[model samples]
Target: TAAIPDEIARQIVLPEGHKDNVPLFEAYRWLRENQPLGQARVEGYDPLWLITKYADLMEVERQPQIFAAGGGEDKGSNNPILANQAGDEFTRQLLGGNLRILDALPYLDQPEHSVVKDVAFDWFRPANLKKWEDRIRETARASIDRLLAGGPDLDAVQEFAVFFPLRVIMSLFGVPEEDEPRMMALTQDFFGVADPDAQRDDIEALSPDAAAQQWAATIADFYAYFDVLVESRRAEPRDDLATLIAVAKDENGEYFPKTFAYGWFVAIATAGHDTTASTLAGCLQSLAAHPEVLDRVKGDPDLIPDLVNESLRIVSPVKHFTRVALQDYEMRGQKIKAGDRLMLLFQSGNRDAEVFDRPDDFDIDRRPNKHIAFGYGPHMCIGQHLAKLELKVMLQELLPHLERVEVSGEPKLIQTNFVGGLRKLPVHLTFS
Candidate 1:
């Protein structure tokens, strides 16, 4: 067993500690230097073998057979808090089809995963995104307009970042503008339920066990909403993702189960916008903190791609994903046995000094920025192309309209161990 200190172990698994950068990265740095592939004995959770280095993470992800997603035989019982909060039966029944953590593309493995993904591949390809560029740019400009209307000082997370990708994704789903707030609320609550500020109303005050039940109900809320769309789209097919999912078939021309269909819709609606928004909000916060970067990118638009990537590296939104080892393996002289659970810390890998020169510095010109913010291997984020396009369009239209930016208040991040970023970012800026 790796001798993980109690203090570090406590900080890493706690939701509240994720609000700040210092403690999280401190824990990661310690792991990278000392126990890059050692055990993390976080109390109340199963001891997970930690994978901190960039290369090792790549290997783990590259061999999906060796390392699985969805926590193996146990499934939702992977975390202690969760196991104590509710029985596996409750979790499995609550969001049977569309649970983000369990059923999303990230959590799937092997032939079933490959089969589902193959059906959706061509839709998200670079070629298809090329046709989407113009509409996406228009939506980007609208988000900037909302920012302008919000005035001289604004919370980037609320006023701009959240709505930008929400609008883009909603547009793709053929959802109207007014109903977007409902969709936004479902996703934000879905990802941020553990955070006090981000958790749904009334749920925050309850004990963790009750909150888990409420979180399951929130999933139902999402299902209730999207369920209507699935029915409507099947009745009258349209040029939208909802319609596509309504009719998608497998290799043998089999329709996905209602449970799977619900999960697929919820996955696209939630992860599709939430994580991208987190990355976008983090980018704005980074740029605001370093005025020089804004000037550089504003002067030379070519650097926007690099800026987007660096922002992803810094944000590292999806903090950690559990990978189940299928067979005995060796990594960095450490033996990983079959059925061993490994927590692949993406944030740590992004900041590994071995790969990027001066990984701490937010250099927009940093070349070969292969940060695994979107992950690696076959499960590399499918929406990455769309994410890049959204960020590029936002910077092209929005940054040029601003002259200077100064943070008006200390930023606040969502307090969640899972997907997170700035939930509140107050900034004051001068317009051009």
Candidate 2:
């Protein structure tokens, strides 16, 4: 019923607002207490309804028909993730008026979404992923070994966190180890368009259109890389996810379109490890900040799962996703009109006091941690099981060898309203 203040709304959408998260969380707390379901009328972006509560976000996520993921095209807000007016317009033009640049799972709705998701659904399930546990552990050990060999003090995010999960996903995709740097650069450019340090060198400005330009270029790069991979896999199929995708068929038994295949590859390759990398970096930062908890986890390695859960809860790396209302709906006694874009702030919902006791505090013992960090409903993160496995494995391998670890320098967060976490975390580790 009440409108969110301009400054508060800015914090919700601005990249710089999340650099120091205290004010951002404080803004969320204020909105949750005062205007749980409020409209944000920020300049340069479409008016978005801020979903700050956990239950409300879950409700919106459950009813996909009512709150459509791909309905923003009609309202000229095509980018389902957070994007400014110029960015959305650029996307519209780039895709030739299409709703999304890539026809990925996150940009689809209903039966189409289900169809696209089923292509690789079974492969990502927990049961299927169990086969890779030992391999993942091996990768984790190698990563840790590199970290220790580098020195006692290093940037955990750059040296360790980013590569571990990247390697895991890339290995699954059958990408060669030497090609990782290119993948990493493309991913960072794609998701970090707003962050000057992370964006591509060619991006000359910080405008939304420029961001969209970098995004388009990044997508092209992904397509170019996957185009070759798909051809290779089709010629000589392997037991990797790329081979599965290359030979994937629709419900009618026809091979998927090239665009669909490319989109699928790009989505899996980019989203698969980036979010987990952020969480991994966040986990290290949290541990370095809280020595007692680190000590407890070190003493009892069985609590690795709890550590993973709490780290995910607190980190909440994948920020907000946009959903457009398919029709007029009323949520929490607030009116939502047809085609109204709603920004589901998962990071904010993860910290709601109603759901968890002391939600802000990182307690490894907290049970039933119902975090929407990976999102919820049909569009929930398909790589969740792998992310958790990679995290747990990394911790299991690294923690036992560590005698002491703490933050040795100031940590830096990526400047983006979308997927982001610690970009630079300098830590000192004493290896046992």
Candidate 3:
């Protein structure tokens, strides 16, 4: 544990190395076997226990009291225990606004977490989401049209992959077709703030203070835009997520605070698409690489659900999320002190050899696919059901529109340590 190699330690926080997926999973395999519950001390970041085992990671996530999601002990404060550290901490630094704003469900714990999930889940449950299928399928079919019509060669990331999910989510907010581009641009600015091509400015070149201001300004932009929708929804409630939040009440029948309610829109608008978009793009890249897998599912779209789960397993876009130890705890024969941080290597767990049979094999029929691409236990992704439906529909709609697909260029992953998958996927295809 003390003699942690520098390369492995660097891999803990850096994204450049992960662009080549092989070594990242290799490092995880090494960690799982040798240092299952070991610690890593990177130079610019705080030391953290790298929880690698599948069962062990589940155990930590299951007991919210023992291992809270964010570092802070005060549940309501929502300030990260290591607010200034790496990974999602860096994500906060990038979109570093609304610290004390609504906890976005993921950051909340205990009664509050339960309450918020209950309120939001009412709309996101499988039954509720099933009603949105016609709308979702419409977006999916349109996306397939764009994918094939933009043909001969398609850059999957920019065209179909990003557009399909973004469009569906924006529609859910009752955002107009014309405004979808602007919503996407702003989201790109926030999520891709570090990407030179996608960001509004050279945020990576800016100093910490300048970068923080840039994000703060972007978030303010979000607030200004959402405020109008909030008011509009309040005036004339509609069958959209925006209206739902606008009119939603807590267990006590109290309305959500104005700031908090607005934050809910921002949270959903930002996360609701990007992660799913990444998964969609990654799946295409995989399909192009292994046509046999696509062939199996193309003629039989019922297998699309299996393909969706496999893609989520392969991508695991929300790369890693941190958890703070509520109290000193022992696991896998190591004593973790209270207030210590643990980066649950979700991508690692998705490939845990013990959990999934031949975890490395990207198979469409891998039943009982217990991947935690969506976090496990209490904080599992509320949007999981929706994301799965979107992927299933999009794939089912797209595959039938094409006769053949093959990679035209090496797929490029965004150089981001947290929350990244396929950023560029170029392919040459024959449209039917």
Candidate 4:
């Protein structure tokens, strides 16, 4: 292990397993300096090569051949906290698919990720989003309506944000309107950590295989539910994403596998719902803290585009993703071995000094802002456009109604290390 240098360590404000920003930032500051590409050992985790520097991580991210995004089953390919132990069986049980979904899109090298990505791209194109724009706005308005009606003060995360996208996705999937909440609840079951809703992440407290078994069971339950959903979509499908999944085919005219369909359902539902929901608190909380951001947003609704970027960049809901090097390589004179898993710190990269001027300032007008909050390269987020569209429409309506969007207290943060800010952003919103 390399000695933790003082200067290097100071800049690293996060390490691993930290539950709070105070400690997480402390370690991250240390990592920023001492280990731009250095390895570190957390309490219970295996040693991981932490890509602390923005440039180092970006270089690694863009070069999928060297630092591949599809590091399947290998714990080394992910956050030490999120690395799976059961390999392919683990993926099969959880995702109910073959290794195909492992890289599903950008994780795999070209030709493969390209094929799958393009297949979905044809489905999730700008025109498609345009087709659904009015529907998305209607959903957003209905969501906020329900929330504001319930109480002038409510956590947007739980109250409105999460449900809107899930509702949107479910609606798009042709899931019955009555069955929508059930779909949203089940989706929560898969992603929730120790939450009372889905108790999968709590498995770590059990024995290894036992823990795996527990996770597998919950995931299997999700598949069972989605499997039915997929079959139903196939039977009497409407003009929705699920309907698309039902009929989607490759060049050979083969249907997207049941598992792939389920994967698509899960991915779209989760992406459309969770990321937007969780970050709703962030967007609101940050604005709650900085009223000027809210005012600027109010002054010009067209600022919707920049507001989406700025909000997400600051409180990037999905933090970093794991990748592995395809072959041995060297950067900054450090030896990187073949098949080594590395975490591309997207949040860190978003705040990297080399990439953005005044990276830490959180400027709403920061132009040329190419933050990797949505990730980069071929493995970039498939749902970025859809998500942005959703966010834009939501805020376009949301900001105008706020009398005073102020934080009730200190905002709460969610505890998982893989994706971040899972919970907490309470506000004492008022209206005239």
lDDT of each: 0.76, 0.86, 0.74, 0.64
RMSD of each candidate relative to the true structure: 2.8, 1.6, 3.0, 4.1
For each candidate, give its TM-score against the true structure.
0.92, 0.97, 0.91, 0.86
The CA lDDT at 115 in model 1 is 73
Alpha-carbon deviation at 119 in model 2, angstroms: 0.8
lDDT per residue for candidate 1 within 1-432, as digits (tens), equals 555777776667666668798888998888888777787676556667777899988998899877877544444334312232242344556657322333546656666678777767788888888877888899888878877887879887887788878888888877888998998888777776667666566553455454465557677787787778877887899998777877777667777765566767777788788888888888887887898999998999888999999999999988877777777998888888887777778888999999988888888877877788888888787888988888888888988998888788988888877778888889897888
Judge candidate 1 at residue 247 and give its lDDT.
76
lDDT of 2: 0.86
Error of 1 at 301 (Å): 0.9
Give the Å shift of residue 256 in candidate 4.
Answer: 3.4
Clashes of each: 1, 0, 1, 20
- Comparing 1 and 3 on TM-score, the stronger one: 1
Q: Please identify model 1 stretches exceeding 4 Å from their true place.
A: 71-102, 201-205, 208-211
Question: Which of the predicted structures, 2 or 4, would earn the higher lDDT when compared with the native?
Answer: 2
Q: Give residue 356's error in model 1 in angstroms.
A: 1.0
Cα lDDT of candidate 4 equals 0.64
